[model samples]
Target chain A: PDTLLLEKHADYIASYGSKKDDYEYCMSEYLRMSGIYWGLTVMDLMGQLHRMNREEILAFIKSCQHECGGISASIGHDPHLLYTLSAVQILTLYDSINVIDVNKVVEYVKGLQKEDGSFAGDIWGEIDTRFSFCAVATLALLGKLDAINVEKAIEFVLSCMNFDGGFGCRPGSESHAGQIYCCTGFLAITSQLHQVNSDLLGWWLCERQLPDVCYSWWVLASLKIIGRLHWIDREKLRNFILACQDEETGGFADRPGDMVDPFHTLFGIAGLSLLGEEQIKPVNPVFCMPEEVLQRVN
Target chain B: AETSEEVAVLVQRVVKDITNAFRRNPHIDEIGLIPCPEARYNRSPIVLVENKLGVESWCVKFLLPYVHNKLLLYRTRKQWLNRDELIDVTCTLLLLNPDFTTAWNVRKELILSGTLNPIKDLHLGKLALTKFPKSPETWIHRRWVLQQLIQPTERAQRLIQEEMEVCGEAAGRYPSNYNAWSHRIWVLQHLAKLDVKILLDELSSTKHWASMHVSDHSGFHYRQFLLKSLISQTVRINLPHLLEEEVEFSTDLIDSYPGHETLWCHRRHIFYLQHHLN
Candidate 1:
């Protein structure tokens, strides 16, 4: 179990959405776009990008796009910032940004930006730092950060910083590891990584309680963004992440011996990639994508 | 080996029963999925017992996908669903899987256009939270409704108290619920701008809540939020006295609990706060 099951994980993701009538797939349609992002990102990290259906994925991304320029989780879902970012990330991976209306996508991210510098997840008026990251990451990928008031967006993100040096979903909300990842990613994309107190935030990030695979990615990714990746015990986390792999079936679970899914599979692989695993393509801590792909886009 | 036509009929009946259950039991406060591993031959999947609604587990597989695809089909086709159909489809879909963000978006539009009541939406979210206490989308939607529901009057305090109770109930259901505690802090933040006394009172109540649930890191974190808010927001409060009281409270919990890391982590935060005070 200490060794990563790279092939098994790849096969698992590749075959995941094949079942049209799958119960898990049906329930997960709300976030199917993000699910595709997770699967494809990790597949690329494993150098199995060619194994996935490239044309189908590109077509799916195109269909998910609305007339308003945002992309939804699936064909019938409404376009929101979360899935829109996922769609953008997927397109960037395929080098097929033109498959969707890229200009309208930029306007969608722009209109989601509020006067106070916050971005709503969608038009429903729910604000979170996660949406800010989605908006910024989407625009940053499309080379359209100039479309919004970048300063106010940065201001809103900084306001979500807690006393512990970690960031939360909103101002006055509790510091959470996932939200910290988004906020740090936002800061990194905005060229404001220097604004973070690396040592303080890294200490808090290390103190986070989830021994789950996803938390490993969130905390480690945030640390990597702020240049404090060495604060946590890399050897211990590496082994813990390895323990989550299903030796026979070839996927990673959130916990050792728990159910394996595409979401946790990506984080488990991506976590090891951050931990200096030579098996994975070096992942970009900010975008959770391959360094090469991000380099191509940037 | 169910035929497509027969399966569609079963799902349609379930969705209709769900809509009618709301009509029959208007005060239904909770929705849960029962652990029926197999489908019953002829009985309805909806269980309306004592103002609690339960869906048989076996049918949820059929029920969720049917409603999910139906709603999406309508969405993609740009087919206009009457308000009643929109309400029924979304209610059934969200109850089964509350993380359906687009379903919630559909409801948000209904509420905005005066087709859906905001309080009813809040109630729907409250019931959804009972079954999936950590559902982030449910909590997020509740916050949006509360924001729209708020007025700068006595009703504000009542809503604030009601939210605290809801958060407390959810925290009890699921330990270390990040979403519920974050929602609590959001409520208290707005409450702080209105009434500092309520925030101060929360500190005392949460001290007891943390003591009883010593290992709940989120409960302790909520305590930390209250203390920090009290220290920063109010000059009328005796700062040194509150700090001293807080240190004593945290110390006593650590002494009594003896082995909980949440206690130690909380004590560390208090020490940091006291150190920064000087």
Candidate 2:
């Protein structure tokens, strides 16, 4: 009866999966799949993957890899830079990168890198600076950074840097807390740190602190990359971040007393580790790199 | 260096040219006109008849523009006392267009400002409520206006009684409204601060209302508050409904709020009372 309920609810559960049918679908589905990946990965880490079989999990992961060699959120969806990283993580979990056609996927991801060095998630639209980080992380995970045209990718990300010493999501947009993380992490992952404006990037990361250094994982990771992670006031910042945790439910919110969800929970933990909390595992200071990926980096 | 008469004549001519440009163009209709900004419309017999009974009056076509212009002028001038006049005009517009959120928000702002006379504003608010009686903001604003007007001598008792009646009527209209239950709690808390007797009567009355509206979540929300308030009053209240013999509807309140600590505490308090009483 227990399995029967889950089987009956299987369609309802899958209905909640990323549902992209076009370019617009691609972006929205990217956000949705990000949530799905967080949910599955957290549950997987918590030792609750018994609800799903290995074959079914692999099939779901395979559906996201597209004809362009980039992985999408689901089958019939187009290849995207973000989903490619998610697919690599999923495959790496199963210890079965051999099953994926890596050479084709790497080439597809490499082609998305534009002349200036920023990568587009796909061909249908403008390129984002964020996708450059996704491309680098995916390549690093697959041990295929040599397959990428790295010179152009670095130039594109560097050009997006503004007067504030922070990077923007696109060429002309304002520099934000999150995009700075993407640029810093991209360089750190590719071993191109000399190109980074360390002084300005460090100053920008420190500026993100509120009354209590309250910010997202993106800013937290940027601080760790520049070796200025110790500059953050940990006691006050941790208290503020913990205030965002739901007291009744065991999850984190975007802000204090806000609704708890999976995305905030993952980043909330990641943010804590940046300030050197002992309970949480230290995340890769650059690229929001899960500790599992750090072993390959060293 | 021109003579005064000549200069006046030239200014009048320019004004007439601008007005003529606005009146003659059909394309001007698409751009939308700014009607007279003052609250007092020119109420000649012809104008009144046109508004009340005209077949093709300009007022019908430009009603929103007319109200918008008045609101903008009132806002720019910093005219606080004239807000009641604006409220009157906005209420009339609501009768014409019931779905405008801007009108509702303006009405809420006018009441919260507290410059408008409470009795006059409550009457005007009631007119808006005739169109949107189920609107939580409208009902809450109306209760607040009434509470403001009641004199300090009898304010606590009178306001509590008034809210009980008004919230009861609102709950009847929309039984599952969270806003209604929140308003009821606000009134009960006010009553408890005034007199213990009044608080006890309110608790009993809330229980009766909750029993009547049991299928709805708002009812349970209120019941949880009432039980907690009663326990705080040192009155041991036993919830027999939780132990009733009805097979289908016998589930306790804990089942609905499994994760709520206060609800579980209230259940334990009831269980403790029932054990001693038996």
Candidate 3:
């Protein structure tokens, strides 16, 4: 009989960044850009986006963008496709894409596509399907999907799919939920969902023991993307996710009675949103953004 | 128990001691935290013995926060940190917090500037992984350092062995380590690139590791990866016979350990590969 604690979760996320001097906060500066995106997206889904400092975040994202048009996790960090996608997703949610150079962003992403069609995460030449998802998601958000070789990109992603119908970071890698989400999201964004064998992949996903709350979002969204959403028992998964919530602290953890953080907090809420929690806004299974934000772009 | 100024000076001295430890022992193999609650009045917190480093527990609170804030202040352009100072501070902080991607980014820039040796950076990453075996940032930094070698040189081939050993050590340390196994895949793809001998060696070596640890998905998945790679090679050596051995290997392990899911999964992949490849 547990339910979502709406206001507590909102307040928990809205005040996450206030401790600027804490050791944990300072240590986590590398992924602060994604942290903001996760917090803001979850807040928006809860109808509490107004509680966040809008102009402060817009300015932060603006400052994080570098000469190459990719964004960094923070002001002085190196630019990466991961943070770049988060910054663009934030801008899209705020309806403020003009804050950075759109053409330069397109060129940045265009240059990252290697001859093999794999996207490097940054200038250092680390190729991952996660970066492939980031590249496609960022370009698709900017309405510049044609800037890269879509055919070759799809080929690279398809190569990553294992015999189990799940995708990994690269060819000859193991099937993982997180990498599966990225590859599936890449397919969904590129309009190549047909490339995935839904039944095979869904079986692998549903076979997950549902221990971690974050995997709940990844597996659920990937299942939703391939049109086999009913492969798992939603009520059982929903109960498990709800159980991970910290009733006292107002955010979810990877498991019950653990310390809460913004990463798991976002997934917990987003997972419930996928489970038809009427109080929360509809989240796009592919983008992990609100359905309304994705719809308004058209 | 110390004031901010006192802790700052103490942490700075500790960082210097760490640098000297590397200078004195270039092959320091591991770094660990010694769980001592209080500082001694007359002794240094940094311990370097037998090619291993250990930090006292008490000073880490002061050391980490001091260096973390210093790095962030420099990041914001609020405080000026020269190259040597940045290197020292980042090295100290990353040992404690290996998942700090920005610190790794700073090291990458330093390596590019010729101020840092790529080989030494790999060493640092290897030491960090001893404590934090599943750290994604450490694995990512290691890959970046390995990729700097643009050619398939003899040293790169040697590094392939070192990389496999480190991956084995890390996979043994942590169960189902996704980053460690995937980074192993990355190393093979980038460095080895279908050296049939290396692929066969990995297949043979992983057989023993997977047998002892029958429930580990990552270990078995690594074997599955090797099988798929060998199968894809045009250098044929009786593909059916190879798969027959794989099936026998996995099915034997399945019988030895009756209820392990990873063992079952490995056998399933073997069968699947057999069905599709022929």
Candidate 4:
């Protein structure tokens, strides 16, 4: 509502990734890849992407990749499609897609997609619409969308659409704002944005903020992609996003007056950027990466 | 295994190390008999035992060494995991971090190893579930136990009822708890018999519950699973009466609590049922 706290958020993110020994850092190992994506994309939007150690970060991603072609959250972890996309998005930001094995990443993604169209997170045999989006978005960024069966994948994703115009983890599952964003973003990336019932789905996304800064990131990003930016009360939501900022910490919390972390801080700033807040750079609606970085994607 | 004095000293150190381990309700932790929090952090929070139990929270001091020892043994693949030791160690770890799925998996490994009884371990899970009512991972472990008991014995039937009753109390304690609802639905699929009368009775409560709280898509979805399970029986249920009552109940709900996506989605699914997926 006042200033966007761009410099503070950038510093918060930059310093957050460096604290290897912090308790929260250790606690966050399971989601370290997405955690890095949240930080890197926020920095890129703030024009502070260069502040990170690109080679060291790149080296970490390279080390986390398994011979199976998927990247893990960390070096010792099992590979997953979620982390694989984050790895792709991170490399895309640095313009270093070559750092990962494009063919293996494709093969890893290909291996997860079932004949029924849904993709498993890994070999866990857990089929989810979120993983479907991950597979498509990851492959699309690497310019390897053809590596998997896109038509069948889209069929499974659309099959998850609900009467509420929202989407869920799988078909016959209930709608959640987070899952809706993944489904809507999947359509956007695959040039199927027109398939969404814009007004109905837009209402569903805004209805979901009855929930985090992360919700805003998903809802606003999805709304932007589907050309329904006007469907939400932008000023009201922007104020809500700004209110979640921790004034003293120069970062955003999951909610107002709560402890702030790099994860929510990234989403908070990115949500503001989607609201046309001039202090931050425009984030790509589909990828959640900076627009300029996505310009390098095929 | 330790002297009482040693436990006290260890508890104090671990307690101060963490600041944000505050509980939802400042409720006193029973193990260490630690006092509850101040009223400020309220709206009810997850009262971590580290803070709540003051010095007594060192329940871990005795448990930690056992855990480290077993983890080392398990890591070295020296001998197979000792089930008795894993239960005690995991219960301790779960008290501290109930949402830690890996620790639960370790317990599951022990269950599969034929060392610990999955039914006996249900007691361990219930305590954690009481402490962390909304922890989805703990519920996941509950579902895991049901998977082990796939045979559907008479004993399993009693436990499943106990579980649903526990779900009722949990739902009562924390209304519209998504994980609680999910666990209840999951426990249903594994029951020895598709008990329609019990589901109808449960739905009598759900009718009041869902009507009482017109939000949270979880309960409404539970209704769908209930109807399908009833229909899957292919008998014993008056389908038209059930569907009619559901439509009437939903229509009444929307009349009062209009404009909720969950209610409309409920109606949509109810109709989808009637049309036989046309």
**For each of the candidates, what fraction of the native contacts does it recover?**
0.73, 0.00, 0.76, 0.06
TM-score each candidate.
0.93, 0.46, 0.92, 0.77
What are the runs in model 3 whose C-alpha is more than 4 Å off? Answer: A19-21, B1-11, B23-29, B34-43, B47-52, B56-58, B69-83, B150-154, B235-239
Residue range A28-47, candidate 2, lDDT tens digits = 33344454655555334333
Tens digits of per-residue lDDT, candidate 3, B201-262, equal 88878877888987888788877777777777754467688789988998898788898887
Single out the weakest 10-residue window by summed lDDT for candidate 4 chain B: B37-46
DockQ, candidate 3, vs. native dimer: 0.62
Alpha-carbon runs more than 4 Å astray in model 1: A1-5, B1-12, B22-29, B191-194, B235-239, B265-268, B271-278
Candidate 4 deviant stretches above 4 angstroms: A17-21, A98-104, B1-94, B98-126, B139-145, B151-175, B186-202, B211-214, B228-236, B250-278
Candidate number with greatest lDDT: 3
- Model 4: per-residue lDDT, tens digit, A141-195? 8788988888898888998886678886766556777788899888887888778
Candidate 3 global CA lDDT score: 0.85
Angstrom error of the Cα, residue B262, model 2: value is 46
Error of 1 at A216 (Å): 1.0
Alpha carbon lDDT of each predicted model? 0.84, 0.55, 0.85, 0.72
**CAPRI quality of model 1:** medium
Instruction: Looking at model 3, give its docking quality level.
Output: medium
Which prediction has more favorable DockQ, 1 or 3? 1
Instruction: Give one digit per residue, the lDDT tens place, for model 4 in B1-278.
Output: 46765754643344333222432333333423343333222222223443243323233334344444444356336746445546655655566566544466677767788877887657666766666778765776777677677645667777777898778767766756766875676566556356776678777877777878777676787788788778877745677788888988899989998888778878877887888834
Docking class of 4: incorrect
Candidate 4 clashing pairs?
Answer: B23-B45, B23-B46, B23-B47, B24-B44, B24-B45, B24-B46, B24-B47, B25-B45, B34-B52, B34-B53
